[PDB]
Amino acid sequence: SVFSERTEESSAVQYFQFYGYLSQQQNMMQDYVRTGTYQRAILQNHTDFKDKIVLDVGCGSGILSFFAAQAGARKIYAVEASTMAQHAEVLVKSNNLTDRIVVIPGKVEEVSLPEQVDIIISEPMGYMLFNERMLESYLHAKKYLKPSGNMFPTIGDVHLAPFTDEQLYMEQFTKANFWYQPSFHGVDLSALRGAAVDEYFRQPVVDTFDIRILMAKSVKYTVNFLEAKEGDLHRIEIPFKFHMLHSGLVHGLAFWFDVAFIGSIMTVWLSTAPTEPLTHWYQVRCLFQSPLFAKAGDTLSGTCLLIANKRQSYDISIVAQVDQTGSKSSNLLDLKNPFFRYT
Amino acid sequence: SVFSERTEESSAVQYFQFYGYLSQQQNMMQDYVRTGTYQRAILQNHTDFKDKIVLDVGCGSGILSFFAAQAGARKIYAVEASTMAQHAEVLVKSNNLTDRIVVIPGKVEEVSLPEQVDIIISEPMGYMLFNERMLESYLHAKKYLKPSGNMFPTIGDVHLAPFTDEQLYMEQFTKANFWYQPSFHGVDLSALRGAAVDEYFRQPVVDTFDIRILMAKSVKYTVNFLEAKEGDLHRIEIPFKFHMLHSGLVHGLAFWFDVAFIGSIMTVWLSTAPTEPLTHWYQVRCLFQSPLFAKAGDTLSGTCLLIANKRQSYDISIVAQVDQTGSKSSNLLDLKNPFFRYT
Amino acid sequence: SVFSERTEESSAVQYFQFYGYLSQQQNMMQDYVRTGTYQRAILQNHTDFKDKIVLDVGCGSGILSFFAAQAGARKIYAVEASTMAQHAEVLVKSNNLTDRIVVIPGKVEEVSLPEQVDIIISEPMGYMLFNERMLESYLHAKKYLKPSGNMFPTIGDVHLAPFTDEQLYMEQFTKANFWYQPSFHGVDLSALRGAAVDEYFRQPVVDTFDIRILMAKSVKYTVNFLEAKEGDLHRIEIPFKFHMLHSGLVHGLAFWFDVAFIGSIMTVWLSTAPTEPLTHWYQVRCLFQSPLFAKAGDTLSGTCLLIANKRQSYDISIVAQVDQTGSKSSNLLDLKNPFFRYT
Amino acid sequence: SVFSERTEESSAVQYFQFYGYLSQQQNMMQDYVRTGTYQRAILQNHTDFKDKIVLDVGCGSGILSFFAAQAGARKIYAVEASTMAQHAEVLVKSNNLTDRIVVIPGKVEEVSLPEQVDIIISEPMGYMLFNERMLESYLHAKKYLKPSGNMFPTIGDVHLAPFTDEQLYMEQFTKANFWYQPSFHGVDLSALRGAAVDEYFRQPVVDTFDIRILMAKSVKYTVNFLEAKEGDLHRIEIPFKFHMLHSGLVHGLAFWFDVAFIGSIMTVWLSTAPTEPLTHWYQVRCLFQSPLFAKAGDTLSGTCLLIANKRQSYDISIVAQVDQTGSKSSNLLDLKNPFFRYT
Ligand SMILES: CNCCN1CCC(c2ccc3[nH]c(-c4ccccc4OC)c(F)c3c2)CC1
Ligand SMILES: CNCCN1CCC(c2ccc3[nH]c(-c4ccccc4OC)c(F)c3c2)CC1
Ligand SMILES: CNCCN1CCC(c2ccc3[nH]c(-c4ccccc4OC)c(F)c3c2)CC1
Ligand SMILES: CNCCN1CCC(c2ccc3[nH]c(-c4ccccc4OC)c(F)c3c2)CC1
Ligand SMILES: Nc1ncnc2c1ncn2[C@@H]1O[C@H](C[C@@H](N)CC[C@H](N)C(=O)O)[C@@H](O)[C@H]1O
Ligand SMILES: Nc1ncnc2c1ncn2[C@@H]1O[C@H](C[C@@H](N)CC[C@H](N)C(=O)O)[C@@H](O)[C@H]1O
Ligand SMILES: Nc1ncnc2c1ncn2[C@@H]1O[C@H](C[C@@H](N)CC[C@H](N)C(=O)O)[C@@H](O)[C@H]1O
Ligand SMILES: Nc1ncnc2c1ncn2[C@@H]1O[C@H](C[C@@H](N)CC[C@H](N)C(=O)O)[C@@H](O)[C@H]1O
DSSP states (O other): OHHHHHSOHHHHHHHHHHHTOHHHHHHHHTOHHHHHHHHHHHHHTGGGTTTOEEEEETOTTSHHHHHHHHTTOSEEEEEEOSTHHHHHHHHHHHTTOTTTEEEEESOTTTOOOSSOEEEEEEOOOBTTBTTTSHHHHHHHGGGGEEEEEEEESOEEEEEEEEEOOHHHHHHHHHHHGGGGOSOBTTBOOGGGHHHHHHHHHTSOEEEOOOGGGBOSOOEEEEEETTTOOGGGGSEEEEEEEEEOSSOEEEEEEEEEEEEEEEOSSOEEEEEOOTTSOOOTTOEEEEEEEEEEEEOTTOEEEEEEEEEEOTTSSEEEEEEEEETTTTEEEEEEEETTSOEEOOO | OHHHHHSOHHHHHHHHHHHTOHHHHHHHHTOHHHHHHHHHHHHTTGGGTTTOEEEEETOTTSHHHHHHHHTTOSEEEEEEOSTHHHHHHHHHHHTTOTTTEEEEESOTTTOOOSSOEEEEEEOOOBTTBTGGGHHHHHHHGGGGEEEEEEEESOEEEEEEEEEOOHHHHHHHHHHHGGGOOTTBTTBOOGGGHHHHHHHHHTSOEEEOOOGGGBOSOOEEEEEETTTOOGGGGSEEEEEEEEEOSSOEEEEEEEEEEEEEEEOSSOEEEEEOOTTSOOOTTOEEEEEEEEEEEEOTTOEEEEEEEEEEOTTSSEEEEEEEEETTTOOEEEEEEETTSOEEOOO | OHHHHHSOHHHHHHHHHHTTOHHHHHHHHTOHHHHHHHHHHHHHTGGGTTTOEEEEETOTTSHHHHHHHHTTOSEEEEEEOSTHHHHHHHHHHHTTOTTTEEEEESOTTTOOOSSOEEEEEEOOOBTTBTGGGHHHHHHHGGGGEEEEEEEESOEEEEEEEEEOOHHHHHHHHHHHGGGGOTTBTTBOOGGGHHHHHHHHHTSOEEEOOOGGGBOSOOEEEEEETTTOOGGGGSEEEEEEEEEOSSOEEEEEEEEEEEEEEEOSSOEEEEEOOTTSOOOTTOEEEEEEEEEEEEOTTOEEEEEEEEEEOTTSSEEEEEEEEETTTTEEEEEEEETTSOEEOOO | OHHHHHSOHHHHHHHHHHHTOHHHHHHHHTOHHHHHHHHHHHHHTGGGTTTOEEEEETOTTSHHHHHHHHTTOSEEEEEEOSTHHHHHHHHHHHTTOTTTEEEEESOTTTOOOSSOEEEEEEOOOBTTBTTTSHHHHHHHGGGGEEEEEEEESOEEEEEEEEEOOHHHHHHHHHHHGGGOOSOBTTBOOGGGHHHHHHHHHTSOEEEOOOGGGBOBOOEEEEEETTTOOGGGGSEEEEEEEEEBSSOEEEEEEEEEEEEEEEOSSOEEEEEOOTTSOOOTTOEEEEEEEEEEEEOTTOEEEEEEEEEEOTTSSEEEEEEEEETTTOOEEEEEEETTSOEEOOO
């Protein structure tokens, strides 16, 4: 299928195994900012659902389909590829909605829907928005979308901003320097030290932080889900030019994302920004092995390039330079393999 | 090969991917009880290594091979299936031991050794000793062992003992009762509560605990690595009959393990027992979904059956009864998916 | 002379220039622990001075000769090589002691005394006791000492103890990692990092610290000034074996020293130990480029070798290992270029 | 050579020993105003470098030669007399510029260049501009300059202005009054008080200050490096006539300096003025022996005479008088021995 061609088996097996756990579904459900904003977006745009045909891509427990039902949808196809599909079905019966919600087990790239739909709803966002590559399945699902059908969410904004955080940098750096020691139990590791630093700084750091650590206004990259094609997400190039508001060491870029549900009655935003209340997405920071020094008023420019891989994630390339000194930093980060720092 | 036949391709990819991270090797290296006891066991039995031919099964960073070198081995074949084999080679050069340590990339079931060896060393122990099924690879490797060659470690003891821990027990329900609510954003979740309970109880719990929770002297199950065959580990039946030292509710069995390096000069023990300083193996507890009441002097009898699966782990069956009352409990856990509870 | 033989005339120029400043004399005089203890040692041992002939080696302002005069000496030869000799003479006249204190300009190795003395007094101690190599001039002066004449101070103890101090280690490390950066104004410095780390870690660090950072009881090395010869100080080998009292990272050895004035009436001690009030000698710490890990109960053994150079200082060699793991550290330091960190 | 003849070899040893430390090169490199302005001056005047032959006098780490290389120079001879030359060579190789930057170990007065150059670059400025007498080596290098070749920097301005700083003046006596006590542990020290005072006053003070202590617009003395000869710097007479903008006690003269890189495209200024951000040159203050009352509108006139010595520095003679009042003072200062007072 489109899905298996882009996905290593051993990756897909881990992936849907993970979403097969009630405890992981619960973890998403309990993100109240997440779950309550989806519900508001759907219920306050009830005219977008009343008597409509809906597709829920990756329905998990079914929770968004129940919201579509609460908003008056006529029929909701809830597609789910993990064994969580069987639990969703149980909930549909115990909630007496068998006449309106139809669970369809399988990958949205591989199942058959009986008819085209008025609106697709999903929660396909990973870390940094793009992790997991589920946004492609969401876009793929537009093959079932009627002309001028809507998408909920409708657009996604990824934000990047340079940050300073010596304590985080040193913390990762101290980790790598285990492999600097010349006599670990009589053994000289130091020859692997470079490869260690590379491996640790490959990991994006997932947690939250104070906005005070940000040294410039964020740059925004927007994906419009109504318009984008799957292939748009195979290679994502995000150019940036920051105007430094503070002097200091730039330790890397911080990422977060917002999505907007652009309904007929109103637009509702769900934000994972550090100025907003914390969600289970936290935020993400990619460190530089070698931080850049900049002065307030310098411009920091470069590119963040995300290249999709068959492990349902991205290889991240970040090149940045302080234009005023030509100090340049190059980094590649493996998004599939984040360091979850949050405590 | 023997390995590819007992192991799903996708489990193996994830498995050797995991050991490909320097950070994971580092995690094992930094277990000081682990690493220092291996070094002591080897160096204090130097006559077992002096001018010998050695096989290191799953050498990882190479660390144990270097200990064999420090003890005077003539030649060490260090076999390693993950990409960590490349880093090990780097260390062997930078430590100027290319004349004595030979790294051989691949699974010990699939590579060729040039010659038979005097002694096999390995650290193949998972959670509960048996997890990961690397003990089978260690046993398999005996095809390269000279007659009367030795094995380091030489034997492994798994210990089981009943525990009482009301807090751990009730945690499971407090978690699952997330689903016991008639209107979570309007949805009645309650029909999934039993499944959520089942799901948590299927997970063995990894962490340590005060030995005061133990209710009877442990029972011991021993694997002699000089003698055992691979197939002995496909189905491990561990009968038990505990004589209750304390009165209370038994909530499950706790597991830990020791290995002994029985050398020519001395026997060295590595223990992960809760009476001993903590190691990165912690201990493991499997809950009964129905506790059992035993008074001091009663006997709690039953069987712990471990059935190897192709996910490199075991399905655990525990049946237990209080002989004096006849009340019974029986539980299934998946050792491939432990709950890591330690903080 | 013996002095110009062992000293670059260059070094000796700067050295006596330095002591030619009243402000530097003032700096030693104002060390109240230093100056008050000398005065106590001399005045409380007044029988060792009453009607005696005294030599003051390197009299500076003259201060110690005045103490000898206060204790009743008959005649004091006050030898001083810097231009400070002229100011000393001024003080002798204005204090009306021309009949008892006789200033003699010159190096003690190069002047002529009219007669042999009953007692030599001096304050010849540098950082780590030995810096400046003035202890050799003090020993050299014994050519003027009558049989069974005394020396004040009489003995010196150097103390060594291992310490942990991650903040100091990182401070120094962070300095050297400047030479780690790949694009400093567009220039890759990283080739020089090894050499930068070598340079920074050669610098002994002078300042004080809480004794909480010491990980074992100090080892003591004693020089008995009555007995030692000049040449004994050319190459000082200090073997050590620390029984670790705390687990953690050993970042280096800390050094301090005591001298004793063993008089006829009492023995007075001048200590620069970190348990004692601060002197202008502070304490000295030699850092390892990579700390050694150790456990309480381990022994840390090795050698501190001091080799005198013609810059009036020492090249310091420290080799240490953790006996239990064979973990080893070798370091070379440059006592003639200490980093004065105190503030 | 010219260098040896004007320099005591022990001063030279000490001098090039100092620049042999990576930490000292680092200290200049990290002065961002210094290093960034040199880089701007060179890169913004790239036509002055593109395909040119360049001489870097005293290249240190090589940093300026790399800027010349970034601006497109064809060939750069980087001359360096300290052992830093060896580290510069390492950087030239690791930055793959061996085809364009040629390191030449030795004094610029003593080496041979293969050819004449289009432009000399250097950072030869000491405290008060002239300290270290490296400006003469810079001028001496013009023997290798093609006709109408350029010099970067092209001119230097020394600025002098009178300051009032009652606290700084009084601090000299407060320090010297240490000596003014009749019984310091029994000794009358007071006879040395005048010598202490003289000693402190001979030291120019290095630190920065609030510009409000300045009493008059600075007077400027200019060296045009394109025109000046070495000999011009042996005796530098700087007359001054300050038009007092403020009434009060004048305690001395403050010094700072600017240099200009007059390129084909633009002129870039590096300033160490107290109105500008701090550099590692700070500013320099010389006290009068007695303060002079001046009214705003009065004129304070006299001469600052700098006489080069063989310690690579200057004896400074300052004579000043308030023209309207006849009131007069002076001082003699030794620039080799400045007092570093900043914190
Ligand atoms: C789509 N909505 C997700 C909402 N939310 C769920 C929980 C969190 C999360 C974070 C990292 C992850 N890696 C894989 C994965 C597991 C196996 C194989 C490949 C994988 O990703 C590349 C995941 F499922 C996964 C889920 C954060 C995001
Ligand atoms: C043999 N010596 C290891 C010593 N030590 C290493 C770190 C710890 C550990 C714990 C659980 C694990 N599951 C898998 C796994 C990963 C992928 C697929 C299946 C897996 O297990 C069934 C692991 F590697 C793994 C490693 C505890 C034991
Ligand atoms: C003998 N009593 C000393 C008392 N006390 C005085 C002040 C302190 C001190 C510290 C380091 C020093 N290096 C040189 C030096 C200066 C020039 C040339 C070589 C040098 O040392 C290797 C010094 F004078 C000197 C003095 C600490 C000790
Ligand atoms: C040429 N550009 C230098 C830029 N910058 C470097 C660091 C600072 C500085 C200040 C005083 C100094 N005296 C000697 C010296 C050392 C030995 C012998 C005689 C000496 O001075 C006359 C120095 F190196 C030296 C360097 C301030 C200036
Ligand atoms: N190609 C795919 N086909 C079907 N389901 C998928 C696919 N990719 C991911 N999923 C499911 O999408 C879900 C992602 C969750 N973030 C959302 C769950 C649910 N919509 C909620 O809002 O709680 C998981 O249940 C996945 O197993
Ligand atoms: N069948 C196998 N063939 C080769 N290596 C294996 C096999 N199974 C596991 N390994 C490796 O064995 C190692 C197991 C570790 N517990 C030991 C690492 C290392 N010997 C140490 O003591 O630090 C991992 O690096 C695995 O990739
Ligand atoms: N070989 C030498 N001959 C004469 N004086 C020396 C020699 N070496 C060092 N000195 C002087 O000894 C003094 C050392 C000071 N620590 C002591 C000064 C004085 N005794 C006091 O206690 O205040 C300085 O004045 C040195 O210049
Ligand atoms: N006559 C001389 N010949 C060669 N190098 C000299 C001479 N005089 C001084 N130097 C060097 O000039 C350098 C002075 C520094 N201000 C400049 C270093 C470097 N070009 C930079 O700008 O970072 C030191 O490295 C000195 O050793």
